Symmetry: D2
Subunit: 324 residues, 4 copies
Amino acid sequence: VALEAVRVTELAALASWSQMGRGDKIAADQAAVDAMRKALNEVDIDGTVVIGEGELDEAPMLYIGEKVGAGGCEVDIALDPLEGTTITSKGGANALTVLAMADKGGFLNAPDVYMQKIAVGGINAPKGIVDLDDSVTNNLKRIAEFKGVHMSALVVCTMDRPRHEHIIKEARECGARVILINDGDVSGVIATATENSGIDVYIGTGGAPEGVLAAAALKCLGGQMQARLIFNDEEEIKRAHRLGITDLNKKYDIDDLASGDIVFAATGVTDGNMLQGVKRVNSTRRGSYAVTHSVVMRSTTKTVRHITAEHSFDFKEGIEKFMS
Amino acid sequence: KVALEAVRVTELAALASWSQMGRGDKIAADQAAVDAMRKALNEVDIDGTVVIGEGELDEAPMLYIGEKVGAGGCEVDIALDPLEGTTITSKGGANALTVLAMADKGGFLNAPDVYMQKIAVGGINAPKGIVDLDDSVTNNLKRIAEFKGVHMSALVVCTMDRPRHEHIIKEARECGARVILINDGDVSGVIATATENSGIDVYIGTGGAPEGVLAAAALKCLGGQMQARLIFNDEEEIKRAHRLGITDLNKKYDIDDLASGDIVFAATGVTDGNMLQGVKRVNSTRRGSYAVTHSVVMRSTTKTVRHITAEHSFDFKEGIEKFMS
Amino acid sequence: MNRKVALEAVRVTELAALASWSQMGRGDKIAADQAAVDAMRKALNEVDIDGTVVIGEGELDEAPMLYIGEKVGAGGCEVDIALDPLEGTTITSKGGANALTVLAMADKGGFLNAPDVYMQKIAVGGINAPKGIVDLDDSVTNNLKRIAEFKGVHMSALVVCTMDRPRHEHIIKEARECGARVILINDGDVSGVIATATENSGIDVYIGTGGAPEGVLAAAALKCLGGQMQARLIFNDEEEIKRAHRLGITDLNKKYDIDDLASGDIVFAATGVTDGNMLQGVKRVNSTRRGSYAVTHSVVMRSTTKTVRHITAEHSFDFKEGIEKFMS
Amino acid sequence: KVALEAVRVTELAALASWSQMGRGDKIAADQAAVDAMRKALNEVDIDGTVVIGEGELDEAPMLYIGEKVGAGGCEVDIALDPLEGTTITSKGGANALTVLAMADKGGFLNAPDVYMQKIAVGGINAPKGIVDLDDSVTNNLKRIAEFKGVHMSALVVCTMDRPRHEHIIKEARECGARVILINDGDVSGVIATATENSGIDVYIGTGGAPEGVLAAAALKCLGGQMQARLIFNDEEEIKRAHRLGITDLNKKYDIDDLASGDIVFAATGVTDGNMLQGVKRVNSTRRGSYAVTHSVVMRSTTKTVRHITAEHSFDFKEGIEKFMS
Ligand SMILES: O=P(O)(O)OC[C@H]1O[C@](O)(CO)[C@@H](O)[C@@H]1O
Ligand SMILES: [Mn+2]
Ligand SMILES: [Mn+2]
Ligand SMILES: [Mn+2]
Ligand SMILES: [Mn+2]
Ligand SMILES: [Mn+2]
Ligand SMILES: [Mn+2]
């Protein structure tokens, strides 16, 4: 039941794209959530949303604990109908629609709080190539020697945020190159394991669900990632305690975020550093269509599929027919 | 419900066929693909009857006409070829494919395994009637060139390199058209007419009827026109055809008459062709060694077409024959 | 002019792009521009042209330059050469999108001689777009429905691109109120404008105000790809109108057609430094068949022959040394 | 240095050949390629001497051995094939190329047009002596399989489908290697060993000597090893080797012996093949209709490889024969 996930993320990405460049992040997310639930309920799984649009009193669709699917195997479901709602409204880089499946319990069940992350790709990388509590340069050195390149050849990716100034500055003292994304650290983490992405390491603090989703994909591509939750509120801490978290400062390896039999699928909404975005295409051959660029992958078989889909459409009509 | 899941079958049949590439052994090629395909197809959630396959249950033990396949689901008719181009693959020539098509019951033309005249052109907007087998090559190419908005000498016509086609090749060439020949693979050659950047505008030729119905099914999804006529040389062949309900022995079949209803079509390239790229061995830093497959899966109802590049893990320090069933 | 003058120009943009890339993500916009200028000036002096620079980089402290009037090659035809060693020094310094290295050539006089002022830009691609489809004096909504009708699509399918700058809030609001989609780039309106005529850029229209040398450079490409563009220089102060008058410009508010920006026999070459909406950026590749290399992606195109070439280059390098051994 | 402008010479040669693709007229294919490549070669700022071409003067009027070509520049030796695969192009088959290589004087084995034994493998790191014409096929492959880090059953060996290779095929298959056959074009077939994702690891075969030198000029830029040996069957064949200086008739040439020094290599694809995509007609509305060519150009000294996809405006309402002289 892996391949079907890609039509879910495909339809959600087409819905997001009808709202790209509209300046309305509410309407982009709403379009995506609508398309994702409609499509997800025609998938033969008994899915339980463990990461999604929020918890029930905030999100009427795709909330934590909602059961989804038409019936089938029992699966834990980690969604983000639109990763990059603000990116999409702006037309910026790195927006995605994401869907990951695991056996029940396979995903870290953590609140939607911030998370420190470090990640690197490679098939043959020892767990321990990256350590959150080590220095950037000692992390970069271990990585530069595993890859066989001078440290200054490494390209490090992080988000353009003040909280990242010390990472940016420390990696830059010993020669490494550090490129900045405005948003999209699901894409930024997975790029470390994506051919020709041009990114070797991702370092930074972003949302916790977004980190689990990326860890799911890195679990299928090969690579390492360590993560720590960060709490600001005291209801965040009570939220965590309720979920069974006793150690607020626990480090998580990539296996602690996503273990066992993982299916991951994603579709580009905009051009980013991992997937290409949805495009309008004309042709005399088949008329006009929207192209989507997707990836579905599986941790057991290590198989990765790259899917380019042609979806017929007549753009003489309003674009908002790509909403469901 | 089960469309994308069809690619995994043609992928496994193609890796199986590929391990037999250039081995000189057309039988081992065909057997590896049939085994991979039947193993993979029984593990798809359909209730499938094979209507086009490896043979009748007499001649072929596996994937025979009438065989039930699938793990359980909705009733579908199955049109398959585990390995289109067994000889191609044994030699590593162009255009070998593994093919799998599925329709509603009765969607596929039920014809005996006789020869079949084919003429195919691609284009979503091509009018039915743009090609006719009773009309001449020149007048067919004439209308096609007009429809495509090109001088007729820009048209590229594909046919097989066969003595039986010798007059096709000269007639098309008198009036300026370019005519290229493939050594085998008229499933790929017909489908190439509606494949982007194939470089092939028209297919004209005679070959197997199963191969004709499979190519018609892909063209019904990609948009295009095709006309076919069954060819009878024998009296058993004509008895054969009466019992399948055929009465007009030189009927001309349209695309709609070859494949109709809710068609899904899947193919994976075995060797490089004019429609799909073949299986290749790849090394990388990031994931080590894998085989890459290139596949296409498409659906007539939605007109959605998917191009799938798959990375299947493997260590080639072992033999290559560890991609079989 | 001749046939030597085309495909060799990509060698220039490729060496500048490699030098810029060794400075990608270092946070030093000065060092990046310096590497690009030095590499480009060294490679450009291996190109059989008696070139005169008519368009330089940006500022004299922002890096050195190939200055307006400098003479390069010195062994060939009387060529005006417009060039940007690193378009996107800030972009490159932080690894953002749309950074390019650009070289354009013309017959003497073929480029618009303007000062380095801002310029209003309106661009669309399509080789059948009739001059007149975009007019700066028309409203945004009225250019967009003129473009939607010529593209045979509903207005809400168009993608308008512009820079995330306050001076563009009005173009953004006015284009979104009648249904159009407006995407934003942080920088890079050479890439942004040329995008309108790059297959699968996803960009239908560019509308925005930016540097005038950038506009001419974009125009030289659009002239080669088929497209329309109209431009108007913009002047804030008198000490900067004087610059215009010194250069022969009398009508401060002239609208410039794409012919006026770039005319006659045009050659355009560009190489991507970072990934953008026109060109992929430089990447490190590992392989066993040829070891390690850096891959560049470039385009070179001619206005007289309409010929466009997309060039993927493999340059070997040992990534066991510093990355700083790509500078020149 | 004019090195990259080589590309447009092979591009024009290729557009002219393509206009004869699938016409069953190989002379007309060859002629169109010969004027197209001679006319545009004369715009290149070189002073070139054809050391390898489409004939001697008393056999070939144009691009004959020794002819002075160019418009003035650095003295250079010129190794041409205006169309590699004249019969291929005539029938639309795989692997037709146009080829142009430059070198400092004396850089190319000034070889007479005779048959040439060949064995070639790709890879920047292969030691000279990885392949040797006198070793057995099973011993060469074991060595290559070792160097490429795979089981010999994973290797893909290429060779022409010619009886003279009955025994190459059989011996290589007998210890498990995979052998794929091409109908023609052993320039593309040899270079393919070093082309990324070609699918071919080793070429072993006997074909024309000039085609061997052109290939080795490309392997010299991509990284590889190649042995060649001239073969003679006529006393007239041996006289041509004697006229051209050659004393040792059974010499084994190394790659450096076929091509040495500052080498530029340019090729454009005519038809799809195992090294380059062929010319295609394209219709967009953004730029109208065009022909797309696919070329590669490399230099021995810098090791830089450039892949070049070119768009050539053309009106296909007009006959296709404007892409000529
Ligand atoms: O000040 P910014 O935003 O870095 O823009 C610099 C650009 O302006 C110019 O100086 C003139 O447009 C350009 O050459 C340069 O690329
Ligand atoms: Mn989201
Ligand atoms: Mn979030
Ligand atoms: Mn078969
Ligand atoms: Mn058959
Ligand atoms: Mn600049
Ligand atoms: Mn020849």
